[PDB]
Design a protein around this ligand. Structure first.
Ligand SMILES: [Mg+2]
Ligand SMILES: [Mg+2]
Ligand SMILES: [Mg+2]
Ligand SMILES: [Mg+2]
Ligand SMILES: [Mg+2]
Ligand SMILES: [Mg+2]
Ligand SMILES: [Mg+2]
Ligand SMILES: [Mg+2]
Ligand SMILES: [Mg+2]
Ligand SMILES: [Mg+2]
Ligand SMILES: [Mg+2]
Ligand SMILES: [Mg+2]
Ligand SMILES: [Mg+2]
Ligand SMILES: [Mg+2]
Ligand SMILES: [Mg+2]
Ligand SMILES: [Mg+2]
Ligand SMILES: [Mg+2]
Ligand SMILES: [Mg+2]
Ligand SMILES: [Mg+2]
Ligand SMILES: [Mg+2]
Ligand SMILES: [Mg+2]
Ligand SMILES: [Mg+2]
Ligand SMILES: [Mg+2]
Ligand SMILES: [Mg+2]
Lengths: 128, 147, 104, 52, 187
RNA sequence: GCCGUCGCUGGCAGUCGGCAGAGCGAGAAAGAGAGUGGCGCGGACGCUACGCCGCGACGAGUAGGAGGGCCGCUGCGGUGAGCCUUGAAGCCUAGGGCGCGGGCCCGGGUGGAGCCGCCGCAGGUGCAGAUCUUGGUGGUAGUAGCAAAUAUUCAAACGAG
RNA sequence: UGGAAUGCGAGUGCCUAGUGGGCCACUUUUGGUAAGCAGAACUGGCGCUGCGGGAUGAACCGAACGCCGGGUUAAGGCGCC
């Protein structure tokens, strides 16, 4: 009974792994979030061979399939029932994701509405 | 607005926009206008020529209101009176000449730069210029003095 | 504390990064520098060039009326040459019509 | 150090000027004091002119 | 790889006005439409001037518009300006003028209307003559700003009548050494 | 093939519909111009023009410069008939994903009362270093050591000892 | 008949950071017996710059960099590594 998208193109991504920060492995103070290394003698920002890589703009995603989940749908945070009618004319290309804070008493009458509206919800069994 | 400034894009670059080789030291040239004659001579001569030396006579107790004399030019002389005085002197036929009192507007000297409209005037002023008086005769008009 | 004393190494390339441009050649170059007495007589010539105007028209309009009795006295193969004429959008309009009618 | 082109400006900030700083944050709180005492005066002199 | 130089790849012209007002950002929409949909190089110049900063479109004076519209031939034409039409109190007679500018000062509206001329807007002009036929483009003096007197060859240089930046001008403000042939030298 | 920049100072207000007639890519400056005489009621999308679309060329970079951030932090004016004891902040997470990235969103857990989205406003606003500051904790390590001044032994008592 | 060829849109104005220790190479070149020495000239590099080769390598040969698929090369190579 899955809610199919309008069209399901082939999603191709030029890179899957994250871009870890230089020397985020020898240390615990260095988190995995990326920071462009600006040191003089640095071996990563000279693009040596076999080193860590750098987030160029070349890795960009195809604009036709950018932000598009593996279900062929884009996404939208939904904070209450009223924010579905905004999405009821984008049915076959966007989906709904009830927020993290919406309690289960409201999230039930939100999944109910999106069910009538045939809008697909990514977390429809969330809280219960 | 700090959020618009240039120190918000300068977080993460070591020298903070100021150089790796030559640091941003405190006063690497002296403070203020120092070295006006020694190591800032090319600048004090290319951009402030004549800044060094004396010239002329001193005047100890100068009072800036003995030498008060604001001037008005002939081009905007006819702007001191209303419009229904210049056009009333246009439509006039008995040769009467409107009296433009300048020291009443706030000028002492009358300089003559602009053209004048062909009609007589009676310019009351404190000081007159030769040309300002000739441009008034050549149109027909009187240069009254008021002490 | 001996430091390098002088060089011109990168200079011939800094000069060409923004090019070496000859000065701005304008017509009507300035007259500063010319000798005083000559430029004083050239100023006396300009100051009085108008003095011979009403006599200058008497000749310009003269030779311009004479311009009337001046001028009113005198007053690769046949194949690809015919195809380059039929294929003219304007000049070949009637050689094209003569062919369009040809198939009736 | 002077830049390329600009003024020779002399700032008069070579004394301990941060000690003797005078801020006008009480200007609105003294305009009301003056107006109040001016109407206490215009009530003390009952029919006499208010300007003096 | 190719051996080109990208020093000048980014042309620095103004793609759009920097202001955010919506009575200008609508004029610029109408004139960008006329500019692209007509073959008149008038609309393109009006648009390119609607982009320009407040220092590149200066004010016009009523007197300079008089003497620029008195030139022989250009009678019964509409004087188009992109800046503002300031007054010029040192002119006594004003003819009738068809005008179209962005602003007209409240003492030049008086004179022009009492004369009997029309004061159009850029939308009125675009409706009267879309291709801009019968117009006279004008623009105020650009070197009028006092700023252009300090520009050029630096002062203290043989025959460089460039104005210096001085706190005040007087007897004892830059008049001593690089100016007197007596004290040192002069240029 | 995809991403981006630059250029074309490119194209698109023509979605001109029974008040209709659906065109401006084609080698050749200019009108699918006017007049003057010889049934069935039908037709996708678009256009936040600060938007959308089409073409080519291009893409290194320290010092430095500039732009764009729907990157992030804290408060202020508005605004979400915003979220929340049917569980907010915070923190943990071999769970699902988004974005080149800064970062972000969901699920599960813990927790117990406040918190956020947008348009603007403001700033003591983003850390890997500074023999940085304060606090906490490791390997060294159950290691060094508990060695100046000769000396202790037996039985009994109290006592869990 | 826009008066040689080929190529390419140019001109102009403000404001301006950083820099003002350099080094190497072909060729010429001064001091010195010479030096991985001191000092100049022209051009190209390293610095600011990865990549394939030279086992290794700031500077040598090739060649300059968005992220990818196929094909072909340069300089170097093809007993095994
Ligand atoms: Mg930098
Ligand atoms: Mg430093
Ligand atoms: Mg800087
Ligand atoms: Mg310095
Ligand atoms: Mg400083
Ligand atoms: Mg000395
Ligand atoms: Mg400096
Ligand atoms: Mg390339
Ligand atoms: Mg780059
Ligand atoms: Mg963990
Ligand atoms: Mg608890
Ligand atoms: Mg604070
Ligand atoms: Mg730290
Ligand atoms: Mg021990
Ligand atoms: Mg002891
Ligand atoms: Mg040196
Ligand atoms: Mg130095
Ligand atoms: Mg040496
Ligand atoms: Mg050497
Ligand atoms: Mg380096
Ligand atoms: Mg260096
Ligand atoms: Mg370089
Ligand atoms: Mg190299
Ligand atoms: Mg070897």
């Amino acid at each position: 009974a899955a809610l199919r998208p309008l069209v399901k193109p082939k999603i191709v991504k030029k890179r899957t792994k994250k871009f870890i920060r230089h020397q985020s492995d020898r240390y615990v103070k260095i988190k995995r979030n990326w920071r462009k290394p600006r040191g003089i003698d640095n071996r990563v920002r000279r693009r040596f061979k076999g080193q860590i890589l750098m987030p160029n703009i070349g890795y960009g995603s195809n604009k036709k399939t950018k932000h598009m989940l593996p279900s062929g749908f884009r996404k939208f945070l939904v904070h209450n029932v009223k924010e579905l009618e905004v999405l009821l004319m984008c049915n076959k290309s966007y989906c709904a994701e009830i927020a993290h804070n919406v309690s289960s008493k409201n999230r039930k009458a939100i999944v109910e509405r999106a069910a009538q509206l045939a809008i697909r919800v990514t977390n429809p069994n969330a809280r219960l | 607005p700090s959020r618009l400034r240039k120190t918000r894009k300068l977080r993460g670059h070591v020298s903070h926009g100021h150089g790796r080789i030559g640091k941003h030291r405190k006063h690497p040239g002296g403070r203020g206008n120092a070295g006006g004659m020694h190591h800032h001579r090319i600048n004090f001569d290319k951009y402030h020529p004549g800044y060094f030396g004396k010239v002329g006579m001193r005047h100890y107790h100068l009072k800036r209101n003995q030498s008060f004399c604001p001037t008005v030019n002939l081009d905007k002389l006819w702007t001191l009176v209303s419009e229904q005085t210049r056009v009333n002197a246009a439509k006039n036929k008995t040769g009467a000449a409107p009296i433009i009192d300048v020291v009443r507007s706030g000028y002492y000297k009358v300089l003559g730069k602009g053209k004048l409209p062909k009609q007589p005037v009676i310019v009351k002023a404190k000081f007159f210029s030769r040309r300002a008086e000739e441009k008034i005769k050549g149109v027909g008009g009187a240069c009254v003095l008021v002490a | 504390a001996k430091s390098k004393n002088h060089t011109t190494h990168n200079q011939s390339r800094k000069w060409h990064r923004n090019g070496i441009k000859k000065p701005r050649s304008q017509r009507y170059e300035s007259l500063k520098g010319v000798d005083p007495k000559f430029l004083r007589n050239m100023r006396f010539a300009k100051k009085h060039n108008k003095k011979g105007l009403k006599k200058m028209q008497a000749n310009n309009a003269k030779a311009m009326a004479a311009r009337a009795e001046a001028i009113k006295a005198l007053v690769v193969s046949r194949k690809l040459h015919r195809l380059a004429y039929i294929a003219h959008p304007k000049l070949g309009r009637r050689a094209r019509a003569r062919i369009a009618r040809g198939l009736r | 150090a002077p830049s390329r082109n600009g003024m020779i400006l002399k700032p008069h900030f070579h004394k301990d000027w941060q000690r003797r700083v005078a801020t006008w944050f009480n200007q609105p709180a003294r305009k009301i004091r003056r107006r109040k005492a001016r109407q206490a005066r215009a009530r003390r002199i009952a029919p006499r002119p208010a300007a003096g | 790889g190719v051996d080109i130089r990208h020093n000048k790849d980014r042309k620095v012209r103004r793609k759009e006005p920097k202001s955010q007002d919506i009575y200008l950002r609508l004029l610029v929409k109408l004139y960008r439409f006329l500019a692209r949909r007509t073959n008149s190089t008038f609309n393109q110049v009006v648009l390119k001037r609607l982009f320009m900063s407040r220092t590149n479109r200066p004010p016009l004076s009523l007197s300079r518009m008089i003497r620029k519209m008195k030139l022989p031939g250009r009678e019964n034409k509409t004087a188009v300006v992109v800046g503002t039409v300031t007054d010029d109190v040192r002119v006594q007679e004003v003819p009738k003028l068809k005008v179209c500018a962005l602003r007209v000062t409240s003492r030049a509206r008086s004179r022009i209307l009492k004369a009997g001329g029309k004061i159009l807007t850029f939308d009125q002009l675009a409706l009267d003559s879309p291709k801009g036929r019968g117009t006279v483009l004008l623009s105020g003096p650009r070197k009028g700003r006092e700023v252009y007197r300090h520009f050029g060859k630096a002062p203290g240089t043989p025959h460089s009548h460039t104005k210096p930046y001085v706190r005040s001008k007087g007897r004892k403000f830059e008049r001593a050494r690089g100016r007197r042939a007596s004290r040192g030298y002069k240029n």
